[model samples]
Target: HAYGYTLTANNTAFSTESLDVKLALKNADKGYYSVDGSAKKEFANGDSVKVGEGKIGNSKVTLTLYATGADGVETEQTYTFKKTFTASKTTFSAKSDGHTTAPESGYYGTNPEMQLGKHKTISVDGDLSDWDSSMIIAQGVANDDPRVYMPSSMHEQPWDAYALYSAWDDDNLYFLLEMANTTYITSPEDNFAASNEARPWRNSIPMYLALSIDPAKQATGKAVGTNKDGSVYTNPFVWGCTNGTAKDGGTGFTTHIDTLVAFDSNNSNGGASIFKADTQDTDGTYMFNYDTRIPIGVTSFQAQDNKNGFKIKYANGTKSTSIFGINAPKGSRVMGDNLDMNSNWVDFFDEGYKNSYGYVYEIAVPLNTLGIDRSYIETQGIGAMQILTYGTSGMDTLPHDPSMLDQANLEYSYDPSTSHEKEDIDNITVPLARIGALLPDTEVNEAPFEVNFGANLNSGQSAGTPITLLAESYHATGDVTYSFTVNGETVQNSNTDSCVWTPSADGTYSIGVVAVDANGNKAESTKTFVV
Candidate 1:
């Protein structure tokens, strides 16, 4: 007769908490047996049988334990038990790199952090369908209700809707800006011609993106700037047009991919004076000095009408022959010639791609170009960023300033008609006080090879006793050699493992041994013994 049968989990007697289970025959002499409807197998009087891996929840699961006798005969037994599966919650704070899988709601404690996954290839043709939505590090309401009136201090307002998308590899840092209801428009090819008085920020639209190596600096609003005296100073991280060539009026959809920089007097354009030629210049002579005008090769320079309004671009240098005629040369370098804008790389999309809602602007900036180190991508990938748009009224930031308390106050609005209960829209606005989740092309080295080392003495010896000093060491994938020393003397040749030495004079003689691995890692130990 088949007697006792036992079941256990995780090598212990069957319990509700165990995720894996095993069955056994305690006191039954049988040919073979099967557990949990598994194939039949030979069993001894006391043999632990593996019934396969499975989870048993709160509900009862009938486990069939059976045994086969000789001559193809079989006997069966049924066991019912409950296995409790406890699911512990994983808090969002568990991540150390400030990376989040989704956009954060409510306040902007830690702005939306995303892991920039590795993408070998990305095209900057203003088409982002190839990029996955998850790559979005952060998103928010870029524009406020059209009905709400904002103060003039807000400057240029944002678009109806907006979002910032980014990706990276070794060669380039890819980015895309999605704007809503924007139409395509461009200044006249001869923007300086008397017939067409069009300007970049006025007739055309422009966007701003600022970057910094330290996320804390961006959050705290600590930025550096160049003053009119050609001296560098610290500012609240200002973002403004830097330098670029004129748009080809041939088409309204002109794409301007050029370098950008925060407002600084050292800039080719006379810093804040670029807004209005310092009217102080008496001779009707251009308000700015030759160095402050647009760079020689560049066709256009974006500035503001009055220091009071939003920024706009004026055609100078080779692009036009106007009031601010090109100086032709500045300093030792000749103007209206080769123009090399410093590497704060920036890009701007034209209005020709505008839809019924508005226009779409896209840009891409490489990390190195912005003075960021690639190694930070793997370890502490955090930075700060801000995106603002040049609107009809003036320049306006998405979330606004100081307290950053108001969320809805810009140029865009969402359709409250939808019952989605979320702020999901075709376009998004990403304002980052801190940056992170950088995915780079090369894998970061986290764990490096190290040597496990020690020293051994052949025998415990007194002052008069002779002993053999031995070096012991190991490395994951390299050869190890040894060096033995007594009282600072090289008694053995380099790479020698052992050396025989006699402590002729006691008084706590000192002996030392060094172990070195093929990789040049060295470890040393010393021993003192009394005679």
Candidate 2:
């Protein structure tokens, strides 16, 4: 974030394949595995292997993991694991588990917190030239470290995200996600791996923007499916977006982008749609939506149909894209105001790192359509996180590494597994405006302004004498909270500038003057006093 980093789950969005099991054994030389009864295969330990196509949704996977039992001392043991595609089904263990020892597990999904940062109103055009740098709310892993889990058939940018910038106004909450791959979204096939996947990696880029709309504590008693840890997750896991939906939430606000971006009933069309929280539902389990409601003041529900609303760029203007001489690909930029399907990020490598190669985007969505008003934002600012993935599992997330709670946690703990994590609700606080704008024009006023400070009486005067502690600064008109203290005691609210001090008994007294500026930093003007 521009100010400071907030909390975030590694992979935040839940999707159809967030459960697709992909594993790598440290000792694969002796390890063996099979998926859905496919012929067993040998892989060197540390080799990344993807299970079958169950993660594609409604598809089920049965993975049989074979490994040398403990340190090559005990007999080799095998464990069978499963993930169901039906909504509400979390039967990770198949009905036919006859082993005495349960399978090992590891947790990956972290419940990351969303920073409630607000930003100024922004123009809806594709250009981010006017967006402030401090408005950035999230960042991704650096370009050099390409550590990605479940590498898709196509490998360009890491899935999920690279960076997320933010803004909002009386009308809409806006954001632009900077992506790491080359731009591609022209094909449309139902399979996760179309022929062109190796080049573009996907038919349409699938991105998910999950938001905590209602700041109020909703009764989460209606338990959604079981957690991987055998516990129950209260807040529902919403994914498998059908179209669009709404939730009525308020607060002073702030807050996606992608190729062919929109909420269409059909997921087969290449593009990511908005995954809205269920405005009304505590039902546990993941369900697929055939129709996502289109938001207000937006055109088109699918990527090809959209000419605006979601926009993308090529690189981060403030950071270097090339790491170790690998120059990232430069996507097209929206030229001037004539942005459309024909729009693309321009080649700016000639311009240097400030305009290198990474898919940057400019996107805006309406508060009215999200069913949120200005009063709600002023009262309950919302929390949101986005993920870029394959409409199945996640690649990376802006707020945290979050994907499906089930598969993300079943890697190595050998524990009972891990439970789902949810962002908390709030009634505690929301600011009237931005917490403090990017660098206020005011300074700390370090220069000591003349103050008629210290006690007027001479040293060793009578202990019971009345002394006036003067802390008035020359500039007394503005809000400069003065602190007038005798020794360690605060005599009065120094905004009044001076306070009457009667020494009960004093020796070598200390008079302190502090000017807490309304715009700049404060200071301590200490002066020794004798009475």
Candidate 3:
């Protein structure tokens, strides 16, 4: 017995009328107001008034039955409508992605990288936490990682989460992980993050970040190609793979890490370990202390809130150096680097594909430039590291344990003053109309052949004057053909959906519009104006 509602419209009210109704309450609650009264009852033409199934008050009340004629004088008609009720609970934070225990009921596996994209499961029992890179990023390729087809929490996670923290500012080498769901599951064909081009099962959680540097293959690097007069481009060395090396030799670079996000509870805290460089200190701290072991079948988790600004790691030499200098090739390709290789050791390509609203990732490295040192981690072995969390998933890994990297778990906070609300990505500073090296074309050939292309609409700057509507058929077909052409003439509209335009000409224009479908399949929206 909890009722609170309003929806009135006439008895005495015109201070601005508006009566819309839709109430059910109790989802949480924070709204409900608009209950003006007056008409107790009114009915004529057939008399009708029944509310809540009882019908009471004022002998079916009235006043010439709400006259619109009767000496005609009715102004205030009354109106009210308010609502509120909100209650939510679907948390799994610590960045989520920790449920690992799927695949043992029906069992299916066919992801040969889904055509080089990603997503191919096959454990059959319970080995889920190894985070098999979210099925290789839910079947790979939005360009290899286009966020699996855009799963938004803010987007970016076609698949890959669970390998927690990784850092290196100045030039960029950041990595993070986490993934859990509240329901937005998209697995068309099982591309978690989504978009194997788009298919069946669709949930989400992804990660992957790969690289290589080179040094007798401290790990591997150098694989160039491009020539046809693009000037010059050719380098090839590429190596550094472990695990099953993708089934003995397919080059898929097999990796399986779950380590249950360093002992879940959302990643417990005692300082999430597994760092590589930074020698230590400087906001981006690190001095070792991450126990590596995650080896289930596949898994991920994520958390969100920190989105201020902080991503450093310099040297844009394009691809000559700056993966911090590789340092993961000294005894442990799961336990076989020739026994432990040498040269100060360095060969950990890194991978942690995608995670959004949590840790945020798309990491990918392939370093091994043989004991690197672009400077920054005063050498316990070189500097430049990325990969800050690991400890249990499976396939037998230890990274030289130290009492489980010093237990404690639970930790997910990046409080950097917090700030993330004004976004459309803006920038406008016009003041250069001097490219008329030879401008002349005051055309007016309006015989009905129309030909106009003048653009300029930056006066009342409200993010308006950006039009584009062309149709030969975008829906409502008739064999579809609606004819279009504004400032250039050719007019004829029946339902094109926005493109009449009358900016009253002033300067700058390159407008356009196109929609041809039936078998034509065409879609367009071009912009550029300053009027």
Candidate 4:
């Protein structure tokens, strides 16, 4: 539920933009339209009316709104929002604009490339001595905005305009936002309203951090990044959290916050604390044995003193009700190190389309911070923790309207890449992990089923490399069938226990392992190796 300005035109010098009341409904699919305060009955607070729809820019929207007259008369209104900018809408800008100042950039860190097994934190660095008086809006972009399709769409094709990451990071837990943008950007004014193009609105990254400190080692928590009206989303969404009281993964949890006063990238000096460690960790098992895993070696996570400054918890067998902000190295800060985004941003997060005037954010967490089982990645190897990048368009977290996918898309382009001939936003992290494994026959429990394959470290691996197969146990039975097929040619080899075949050409090859028992019941394993 939020309020924003509305542009309305009337005859006789009555054309004016007025501030209107709007509330986002908890459920829009259940005949409850967003910005429609169905939860609250009676128009006592003000006239209850849905907003109209219209086109604002490169998007389209249908504003379904109702207006209440002073005499209690209600009028329904609908408008379409479109892009007002007449500039040529070429592809998103492929340039990168890095920050350089106090506090960290809003998104992106000093080091954009994620390192294995290390976590990083970013935070605003101001005292907020004068906070409650200002306002800002933030934005994010998704990796697959152009790819999201409607349920009824027959031909689902990938869109090239989508960015690739969405997440939130502070000095403590890492928060990620997995996005699928459909139509959120079509209507900037009425983001929550329906789109005429049958496009779905993409959800952007936004959080509210609120905390209190009392000079202790522990703190309270309450956040709002992963809930759809107090309930968590069921689909696998991107997330980064450092609250390590429990084991890696399997111990499921999500990131949430109430009000974040510190995550303004423009105001590198601002800080927002949204999570309450106490209320957030319903299982009551965070940071217990995990404090040591923090990349910043901090004792505990805390919030800034609305009055004083940053505070941290101590280990006096007690906790410091809360803490202020975290201190980061010039550029080598560790994960969970609450950094500023004003400077050293390219390394932290960035969108391919240069910000017209806004920025993005990012956080790197050592794999140790998050549970291992719950991850969106294809595979996890040693040396790196998961990282998240989130941003705002209007300068605040939650969009004024929720159904706008464009605004959300812009906020999520975490790993923004460069378009051809463009360097400003040309960025790509080729440091993705490559995983392969070798399996043994069912009966070879004791036999050493060592295997290998070929692969290329570059080009995401294009050749063969040695892949060692793991056997449950050693076994001395029938012969092991070893074969290599590359470019349609079968290179056959046989051995009692193990065998190796080297491809004489540059291409892909498959290695298979087959073991047969006296009864002829066979078990096999195969692997694809690029050389």
Candidate whose TM-score is highest: 2
- Cα miss at 460, model 1 (Å)? 95
Whole-model lDDT for model 1 versus the true structure?
A: 0.34
Best by lDDT: 2
- Whole-model lDDT values for every prediction: 0.34, 0.37, 0.22, 0.24
lDDT of 4 by residue, 1-531 (tens): 222223432110101111133423221211112221122133322233322111011222233444344454444444443211122111111011111121122231211222111232423321221111011111222222211222221122112111112222232332221122222232224333212222211222222222112112122122223433554322111123334221111111122111112222222222322222322234442222111112222222233222122322111010111111211121232322222221112211221221111112222232223333214222321111122222321111121111122222222233322111110111112111111101111111122333322211111121243333221112324544544333445444344443334334565445444544433444544444433
Compose the digit string of candidate 3's lDDT tens values, residues 1-531.
Answer: 222222333232111111123332222222222122221232223222221111011111121112332333332222321111111111110101111221110011111112112212222111233233322211100111112212232122222221222233223333323322111232323333233222111222111122222101121112222345654332221112232121111111111111111112222122221222212223322221122211211122233111112111111011101111112211112212112212112111222222221222223221121223323211111111111111111110111111111111211122212111111111111100100011121111111111121122211222234433432222222343343544445445444434445555456544454444445444443334333
lDDT of 3 at 224: 26
Q: For model 1, how does the per-residue alpha-carbon lDDT over 54-164 read when each residue is reduced to its tens digit?
A: 222223334455665444445666655443222221112222212222223322212233334344346644344546545544343322322112222122222332344
RMSD of each: 24.5, 25.2, 25.4, 27.1
Tell me the TM-score of model 2.
0.36
Q: Estimate each model's TM-score.
A: 0.32, 0.36, 0.20, 0.21
lDDT by residue (tens digit), candidate 2, 1-531: 001111221122222222233444543245555544445555444454333221222233444456553455322323332322212111121111111211111111111122334657766454666564355455443221112111222223334244566677777677766554322321112133122332222344445555545333232211133445765333222333222211211111111101112332122343344433333443422222213434222244344334324333223333323311122222221122111111222223432433333445555666655667756655655544555443333434554332222132222122222111111111111111121121122122122333434443323345576655555454333577777777777767546766667778756776666666655555555655443
